Design a protein around this ligand. Sequence first.
Ligand code: NI
Length: 341
Amino acid sequence: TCPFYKKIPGTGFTVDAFQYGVVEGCTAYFLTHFHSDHYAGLSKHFTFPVYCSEITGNLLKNKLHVQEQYIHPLPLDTECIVNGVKVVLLDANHCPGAVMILFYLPNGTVILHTGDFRADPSMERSLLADQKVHMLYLDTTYCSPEYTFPSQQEVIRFAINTAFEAVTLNPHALVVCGTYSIGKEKVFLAIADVLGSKVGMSQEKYKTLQCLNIPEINSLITTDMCSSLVHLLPMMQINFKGLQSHLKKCGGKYNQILAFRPTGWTHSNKFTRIADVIPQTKGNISIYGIPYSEHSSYLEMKRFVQWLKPQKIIPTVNVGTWKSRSTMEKYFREWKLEAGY
Ligand code: NI
């Protein structure tokens, strides 16, 4: 049945709760972003109101074929009324169109649901600065101290430099980047830019990217693989077998592949620095795994919460085991005792 952490008390609202059929007493279903664990259940046959960002509404329409009459897009950073309740959507620093939602309850309670986010100090100067938050529904994906990773800027630096070097040494090398969902577009766009190429991809992926309001996008992407020296492929094809097969398809235009697998966190983050990462190699193929995260590190999460000083925290990730739950509750207590709220 719908879990309690997907219901907003004092309203007929749910968040990211599309796989439980009709939720008894829900008058509006909010969708924070277009990732499949979040939208799971939505289809062309859904007949309840969906509230979301403009970009998310472009994807629901074009990729899922949800009918237009049920899609309610809202602008960001704007006080809006939904079934009699004031709401604000804020940028989540996750994937394109990902939002956090502020609900202002009739009784005076204020609730923030982060959706999926990567906390940033820039958030401390949004509409959040303006008033108190009583309850926080938090993206706890990486809520443990061992989860460190570099900034997005440092990871892109490493990728740009690595690709630029390889292709300058061998102009017959192809660069390939793995994808399976929206998000992490900076990886393949930054690399294409340093190489003066457009990025080539399948028609289905091109379509997806045309929904995202990325400026000058037509100058940056294409469906003509031949004209482009950066190719996107399904993440599942980013292995030696899949890459050889793909090189075969390029008709002797290239004699080397350098590939990037953007992951979240991996255990090598505990020991190794970004400067020191090395690829997996077999023959004329090299695969780099790069830790490009669109979720809060442990420290970034802690800073955000200690700044906000909520009265109650409700985790939305890793809630399935008692040991996880107990571990998170310990950190919330440390944070609260350290900062004095
Ligand atoms: Ni997500």
